[PDB]
Design a protein around this ligand. Structure first.
Ligand SMILES: *[C@@H]1O[C@H](CO)[C@@H](O[C@@H]2O[C@H](CO)[C@@H](O[C@@H]3O[C@H](CO)[C@@H](O)[C@H](O)[C@@H]3O)[C@H](O)[C@H]2NC(C)=O)[C@H](O)[C@H]1NC(C)=O
Ligand SMILES: *[C@@H]1O[C@H](CO[C@@H]2O[C@@H](C)[C@@H](O)[C@@H](O)[C@@H]2O)[C@@H](O[C@@H]2O[C@H](CO)[C@@H](O)[C@H](O)[C@H]2NC(C)=O)[C@H](O)[C@H]1NC(C)=O
Ligand SMILES: *[C@@H]1O[C@H](CO)[C@@H](O[C@@H]2O[C@H](CO)[C@@H](O)[C@H](O)[C@H]2NC(C)=O)[C@H](O)[C@H]1NC(C)=O
Lengths: 122, 216
C-alpha cells in the first residue's frame, strides 16, 4: 500500500504564507489525482485544491488566487503554496492521494494524518 | 544506475527521457536478463518466448531448469538471457515483431504483447510507421529494455542487471530477497530512494551477483 507524509504547517500571522507538502511512498499500480483538503473546527473535511497527473487543477472558490497547488511526477509529491492567509484558513489540512491497484480497477482514497495550520488575528 | 521508468510509458504522448530506453553509461555489450510471464497459447514454450524476445530456446531452457520444448504454465515468470548492447546512446536488446491482427497499436504491442519490456515511445522512435497506419503483417523493430552494470556496480560485485516485471503485492524489499541482494542495491540501480513509489507492471532493474535462480 501507500504511505503519505505531510509537512509544512504551523502557526502563521494573518497575511502570512505557508507551504504544505506531501510525499508518497510504497507500491501501487497508478497514482491518479492528488489534492489538499481541510477540516476547520466544527466543519466537514472540504476540498481545497486538487491536481491531476496531467496538471489539471481544481480550486475551492474561497481559495482561488491565494493558493497554488503543484505536483512532482518524478518523486510523487504534491505541494500547496498558501498566501494571504486569514484566520478563516485555520484548519487541519489533509493530503489526498487517489490510487488504482490494477488496470481499470477501483480507485482508492489515501489520506495523510493531517497537518495543523493556525493563522493568528491581524 | 538508470532512471526509473516511473509509469511514463502509460501515456504515448509522454516524452520523459526514460521512455526511450536505458542510457549507455558503461561497457558496450554484456550478458543481461529479461523476465516474461508465460502467456497461453501464443507465448508459453521456450521456442515461442524466445521467438518473441529474440533469445534462444536452449538459453531460456537452461535459465529456467526446463527442457527446450517443455510447456510453461500460464503466468509463470521466466528469465530470458539476452545480449544487451549500446545503440544510439541507449542500452537495448533488439527483437522483431510481425503484427498478427489489424487493430494492434504501438501501445498494445509495448504494454500487452511485450508486457512493458519496451515502450510506446521507443517503438515509435525506432520504427517508420505512423501510429494510425499499422496493419497485420507489418514488421516492427522492438527495443527491449536491458542494461549493463556500471563500473561502480561491477566494482561492488554485480555481474548482471536483470529487467524485472513487477507484479501485484511485490516491493523492492521482496524482489531483492528473491535475488539475494540488498534492498538498497535495487533502489540504487533505479535511482530510487527508501521513500519512493514502485509501480506494478513497470520494469525494475535488479543487480545480480550471480546468475538468477532457476525459478522465481
Ligand atoms: C496493458 O496490458 C495489460 C496486461 O499486460 C492489460 O491488462 C490485462 O488485461 C487482460 C485482458 O486483456 C486481463 O486478463 C484477463 O482477460 C481475460 C479475457 O478473456 C479473462 O479471462 C480474465 O477475466 C482477465 O481479465 C488482465 O486482468 C489485465 N491485467 C493484467 C495485469 O494482466 C491492459 O488492459 C493493457 N492496458 C491497455 C490500456 O491496453
Ligand atoms: C537522458 O539521460 C542521459 C543520461 O542521464 C544521466 O544518467 C541518468 C542515469 C541519470 O543519473 C541522469 O540524472 C543523468 O543526467 C543524459 O546524458 C547525460 O547528460 C549530462 C548533461 O548533459 C552529461 O554530463 C552526462 O555525461 C550524460 N550522461 C550519459 C550517461 O550519457 C541525456 O542528456 C538525457 N537526455 C535528455 C533529452 O534528457
Ligand atoms: C539494434 O538496432 C539498432 C537500430 O535500432 C542498431 O543500431 C545501428 O547499428 C549500425 C551498426 O551496426 C549503425 O550503422 C546504425 O547507425 C545504428 N543505428 C543507430 C540508430 O544507432 C544496432 O546495431 C542493433 N544491434 C544489434 C546487436 O543488432
Amino acid at each position: 500500500q501507500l504511505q503519505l507524509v505531510e509537512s509544512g504547517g504551523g502557526l502563521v500571522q494573518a497575511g502570512g504564507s505557508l507551504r504544505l507538502s506531501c510525499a508518497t511512498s510504497g507500491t501501487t499500480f497508478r497514482l491518479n489525482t492528488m489534492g489538499w483538503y481541510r477540516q476547520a473546527p466544527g466543519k466537514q473535511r472540504e476540498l481545497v485544491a486538487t491536481i491531476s497527473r496531467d496538471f489539471k487543477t481544481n480550486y475551492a472558490d474561497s481559495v482561488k488566487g491565494r493558493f497554488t497547488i503543484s505536483r512532482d511526477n518524478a518523486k510523487h509529491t504534491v505541494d500547496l503554496q498558501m498566501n494571504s492567509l486569514t484566520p478563516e484558513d485555520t484548519a487541519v489540512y489533509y493530503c489526498l492521494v487517489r490510487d488504482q491497484r490494477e488496470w481499470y480497477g477501483p480507485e482508492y482514497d489515501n489520506w495523510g494524518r493531517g497537518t495543523q495550520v493556525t493563522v493568528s488575528s491581524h | 544506475q538508470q532512471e526509473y521508468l516511473n509509469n511514463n510509458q502509460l501515456d504515448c504522448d509522454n516524452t520523459h527521457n526514460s521512455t526511450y530506453g536505458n542510457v549507455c553509461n558503461s561497457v558496450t555489450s554484456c550478458q543481461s536478463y529479461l523476465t516474461f510471464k508465460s502467456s497461453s497459447p501464443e507465448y508459453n514454450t521456450p521456442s515461442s518466448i524466445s521467438y518473441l524476445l529474440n533469445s534462444t530456446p536452449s538459453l531460456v531452457a537452461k535459465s529456467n531448469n526446463i527442457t527446450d520444448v517443455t510447456p510453461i504454465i500460464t503466468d509463470t515468470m521466466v528469465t530470458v538471457p539476452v545480449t544487451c548492447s549500446c545503440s544510439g546512446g541507449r542500452y537495448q536488446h533488439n527483437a522483431t515483431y510481425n503484427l498478427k491482427k489489424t487493430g494492434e497499436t504501438y501501445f498494445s504491442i509495448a504494454n500487452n504483447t511485450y508486457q512493458s519490456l519496451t515502450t510506446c515511445q521507443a517503438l515509435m522512435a525506432q520504427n517508420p510507421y505512423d501510429a494510425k497506419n499499422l496493419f497485420a503483417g507489418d514488421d516492427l523493430h522492438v527495443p527491449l529494455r536491458c542494461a549493463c552494470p556500471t563500473k561502480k556496480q561491477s566494482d561492488a560485485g554485480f555481474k548482471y542487471l536483470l529487467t524485472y516485471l513487477v507484479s501485484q503485492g511485490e516491493s523492492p524489499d521482496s524482489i531483492a530477497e528473491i535475488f539475494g541482494v540488498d534492498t538498497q542495491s535495487v533502489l540504487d540501480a533505479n535511482e530510487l530512494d527508501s521513500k519512493s513509489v514502485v509501480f506494478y507492471f513497470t520494469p525494475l532493474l535488479v543487480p545480480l551477483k550471480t546468475e538468477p535462480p532457476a525459478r522465481l
